[PDB]
């Protein structure tokens, strides 16, 4: 996409991810893992909610019938009204298709950005202890246990602990 994360370098999303919108799928000596992220999901949710908020904001505009339903109206004004109404319709029909399409484009790319913003948050946190995979993962060059990967997600990970360990593993 625009930010090139969703459907970009990451092949696809996870159909098992039910507890959130964005998450992690880690593998180590102990076994597998799957846990979602709050900030990234909530940033996507909070922005859609406020985008839906403008939509349902109803106008207090009172209109009354100028075109009679059952009885007949004068033929010349009857063309004027038919023209004006159809011209107003054309404005609101095209305008609607524009808004829907415009808000559709920005939201998809907005959700794409918060994916990339999380990837960039993990890359900078792992500093020089991990190298980039290419498919959206991170190759950790030190023994990172189940509580170690949690310290990344908790945003408490310190590279100074595994700096000497990972660097030597990268270079043999």
């Amino acid at each position: 996409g625009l930010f090139g994360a969703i459907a970009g370098f990451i092949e696809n999303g996870w159909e098992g991810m039910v507890d959130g919108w964005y998450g992690f799928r880690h593998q180590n000596a102990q076994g597998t893992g799957q846990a979602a992220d709050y900030k990234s999901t909530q940033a996507a949710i909070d922005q859609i909610t406020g985008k839906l908020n403008r939509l349902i904001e109803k106008t207090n505009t009172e209109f009354e019938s100028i075109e009679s339903e059952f009885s007949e109206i004068e033929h010349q004004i009857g063309n004027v009204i038919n023209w004006t109404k159809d011209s107003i319709t054309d404005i609101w029909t095209y305008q609607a298709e524009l808004l829907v399409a415009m808000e559709n484009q920005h939201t998809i790319d907005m959700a794409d950005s918060e994916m990339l913003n999380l990837y960039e948050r993990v890359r900078k946190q792992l500093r020089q202890n991990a190298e980039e995979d290419g498919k959206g993962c991170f190759e950790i060059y030190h023994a990172c246990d189940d509580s170690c990967m949690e310290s990344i997600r908790n945003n408490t990970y310190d590279h100074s602990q595994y700096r000497e360990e990972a660097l030597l593993n990268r270079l043999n």
């Binding site: 996870w14 004068e74 829907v100 939201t107 993990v122």
Partner: protein
């Protein structure tokens, strides 16, 4: 020894239109154009007045079917199809300009004109077209003035209505159009007829049209109606030698109400701000595809059936 990143996905996605693609598949989306219509007039918390068989103009003249609705107070007035306004053949000069004025009003107050007639005038004119109780009658707010005896010329009579109220009264009158020269002489006489209406803003003369016509309701003769509004402290003077359908009462509109033209049944269980010919529109979203013509606080009409707004990201299947 690796930590991965990725988004969530669903099995069945929703198709949306974008600037670059009209076949985009997001995870979840919602509708923005309403297609649902309640075929009921939602009138909860609303003092509505159904007219049934009466047409709004009938309220001011007194049609037999509109006898129930000659007075009241409302915030909403409902009008139906096939609603009768004229028991006896005819119409009103700019009747639409009058009808929507009644649908904008929020109540009708009736006030007497105080018209006294001479000995030579039979103020009790009736017709088989206007039926009350079962027998023959006339428009409730009006009086047919004919000669007391056949042939005798209708006397030059001057009738004046005067305003005292702070507001403005709407006065109505009719002009009778006879069906033949032979019949014309029976009602008013052989003399040339002229009906002159005078005020301070309105001056117009009418001459009764006489001629053969097809049968409507069982009659060839017709009465057309005229209307004007008199200001406070202003007087309206009539001058005629026959043909005038005199006003016995003047109309006065109280406040502002809502005017609905729908044939749908009424319901007090729901409440609505938006109405059309097929019922009520109850929705939060700003678009609808039901009808171009609506009344009240309404979503704007669009030509498209469905328009989906995306709430979720791109849906990529596994």
């Amino acid at each position: 020894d690796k930590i991965c990143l990725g988004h969530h996905a669903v099995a069945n996605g929703t198709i949306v239109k974008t600037l670059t693609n009209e076949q985009e598949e997001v995870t979840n989306a919602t509708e923005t154009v309403e297609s649902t219509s309640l075929d009921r007039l939602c009138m909860k918390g609303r003092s509505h007045k159904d007219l049934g068989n009466c047409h709004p103009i009938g309220m001011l003249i007194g049609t037999p079917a509109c006898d129930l609705h000659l007075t009241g107070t409302w915030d909403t007035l409902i009008e139906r199809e096939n609603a009768i306004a004229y028991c006896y053949p005819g119409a009103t000069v700019n009747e639409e300009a009058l009808r929507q004025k009644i649908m904008e009003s929020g109540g009708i107050s009736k006030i007497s004109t105080g018209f006294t007639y001479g000995s030579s005038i039979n103020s009790a004119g009736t017709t088989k077209a206007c039926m009350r109780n079962g027998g023959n009658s006339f428009y409730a707010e009006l009086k047919w003035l004919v000669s007391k005896s056949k042939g005798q010329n209708f006397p030059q009579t001057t009738n004046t209505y005067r305003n005292t109220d702070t507001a403005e009264h709407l006065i109505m009158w009719g002009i009778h159009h006879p069906s033949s020269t032979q019949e014309k002489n029976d009602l008013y006489g052989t003399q040339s007829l002229s009906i002159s209406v005078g005020s301070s803003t309105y001056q117009s003369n009418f001459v009764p049209v006489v001629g053969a016509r097809p049968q409507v309701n069982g009659q060839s003769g017709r009465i057309d109606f005229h209307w004007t509004l008199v200001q406070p402290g202003d007087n309206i003077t009539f001058s005629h030698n026959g043909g005038l359908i005199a006003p016995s009462r003047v109309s006065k509109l109280i406040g502002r109400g809502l005017g609905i033209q729908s044939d749908a049944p009424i319901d007090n269980n729901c409440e609505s701000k938006c109405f059309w010919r097929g019922g009520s529109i109850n929705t939060r979203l700003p678009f609808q595809n039901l009808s171009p013509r609506t009344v009240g606080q309404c979503p704007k009409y669009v030509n498209k059936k469905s328009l989906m707004l995306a709430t979720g990201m791109r849906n990529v299947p596994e």
